[PDB]
Amino acid sequence: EIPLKYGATNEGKRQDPAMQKFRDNRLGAFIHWGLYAIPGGEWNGKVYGGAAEWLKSWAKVPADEWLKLMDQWNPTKFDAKKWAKMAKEMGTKYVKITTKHHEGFCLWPSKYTKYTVANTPYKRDILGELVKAYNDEGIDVHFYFSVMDWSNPDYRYDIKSKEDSIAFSRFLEFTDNQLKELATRYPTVKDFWFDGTWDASVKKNGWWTAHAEQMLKELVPGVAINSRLRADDKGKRHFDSNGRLMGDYESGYERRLPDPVKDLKVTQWDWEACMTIPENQWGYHKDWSLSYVKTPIEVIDRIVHAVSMGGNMVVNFGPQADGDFRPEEKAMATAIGKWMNRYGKAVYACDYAGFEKQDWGYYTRGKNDEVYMVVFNQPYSERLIVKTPKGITVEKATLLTTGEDITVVETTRNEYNVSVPKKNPGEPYVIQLKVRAA
Template structure:
């Protein structure tokens, strides 16, 4: 475009993707787990027998909830069934290759013994450091850990939504120091974590801190080279979030895909991205009365394939109960996804956008940087013929089932660069994968 570039002091630090090994690993994860856990898991979406319709982790903010009573929930926090190793096993079994864990959600309660506030797990009957237990357990399973951190903090006296008075501005200066201290503390206490997942950064008070946030980002990156930070952390000096005033992505990957998935490659503008998804429509923390449509295992597998086919990662949320146990419905979904992943993970891990036109039967993925293309098939047409349009000058050398290489196909060429693969039988009850070994003429 002919648009003039705006000179920015606190815009994006880079144009285009990161190319270092840590980020390349992140890009290849394919599937991740999100965990929302905190005091809100105790009421689990209900207060005094009354069910609230909004997201369970927001219950403190709903009308009629006494804030001080909510804030005292730390005195009831004693999750006797909490077992970080069991969580990590569930994640491993599902096939997750990274986890994002809520160290502090909007309610301000810290799951680590922060030195900078009394509102932590240390001042609960449980006492022990939950973040450490989670980091250690996932590290042990070889699952990378990203720490979720909400800047917005309903418990902190210096938090402001906007800065309108002198008093606000003095308070918020203290809040900024507090935020910085907590972040440096997290990175220092848990040096193996790969990144930070920011949230609660949309209010005017924080959006106005372009210079401060930019400096803090630089400080954190200096402390932990390779640290991954998404596009939700900071705004530029014009208040632009995610993308700066020149439309360039701020941070290492686009963090805007919450409960929605891009439909075409153009939607992601060549950036890294991940999609975070809930099982019900919009419940992150534990809600005892999950209602409305609950996504099935097959739907979640399809979302995973769709994300990977467009170069992103799919991250499924879990909301453990107040006692620390993962609810049965989530365990079952993890197992269902994991059973599928065991056979088909080759089409999900270390894969990228294939460069083939999307077809109605499902999704193409490509083993990153190779000629191996996967067809993840969800909808078998009545004809049993799967259409493939190859990019020009690309031949299909071999086509076979991923689960059974003996079961191969001879593609029927129906016109230039266009083929049918004729399925022999369509007895599949689960999505399946066909491997295409391709050859590009040079």
């Protein structure tokens, strides 16, 4: 045991109702909206292939010139109520919103900088409009916050002098102020998801990360805080020097997911994954033909994968400069929505089932020990292999949509062949099992 003052706080998984809710939600959407939406990946006639929200970096644009985009910020098609309806129709139980990205432009009228929605032609408090609209639909709201801030010159990448230390100490107070502001202006917030905490300046200031966590939990009862915020005394991030998880949930699976056979360790803690529709674009990019774009079933597969291993999944959207969503994103949300409406009993409020992974797809476990087989790969054998843990038998199988009974044949001790449905469902589908222990 190494002694640590700013290491892990939590024991195991939080089991208060607020965390249970965060967990049971399972499916979320991510919104990346900021000034980067205006150029849409293009600067000075040149289209850059990197992530559009990092365009300031790719095109080497100075802060003053970048933040001048505020003068064109006028999303006349924006309508918080439509956005919330879209999220509702997709089947998302929560939404995570970029309050401020690396660029430093704030979607709420912060008192602590001039780079906010207030100083734009649009003027209005976008974030407040969204919080109300989503909450009205019964959708929880979570706040993305970039610690790294390219708009504030007291920011430092590292601490190489007392001068740097002085500047950065001012920067951390500025940050605390924005955070307190967010927590008190918008007290229904359920989570803060920190990003841009990877620089050596932050790694050297673990105490501040632990402080930010404590500060926000005092202000917002039951609020959740991601692991990404946190560094310990030694600069170890996410998990501390004694290997204990910091924050309330693990938050490293970004555009990738744990292996279903090798990474079972993740079922021991809460966690949340996020993903993009193209290969790597979070903010709006005008040309999606530049990388592979996932199909709905590919996205659905990742959602169920996450849940099968006891984690949440958040699918990202990068709204247009005008405040509307591109056609591809509307189609995606609608498709995910249709499927969740039919099969979401195997997703919402479900968890790791403790069964050995099989090739046809994923198991999930319901709140009353339902075991759901979510089938993505249809075997030509017409038989779906189910190997049970010790002491578990399978008493019945049922097609979720129709209620029809599905033949279960015992092949060996602890193994069965569950038949495919008489009629091929033509899409990833669910069979529900009734199981019994000894």
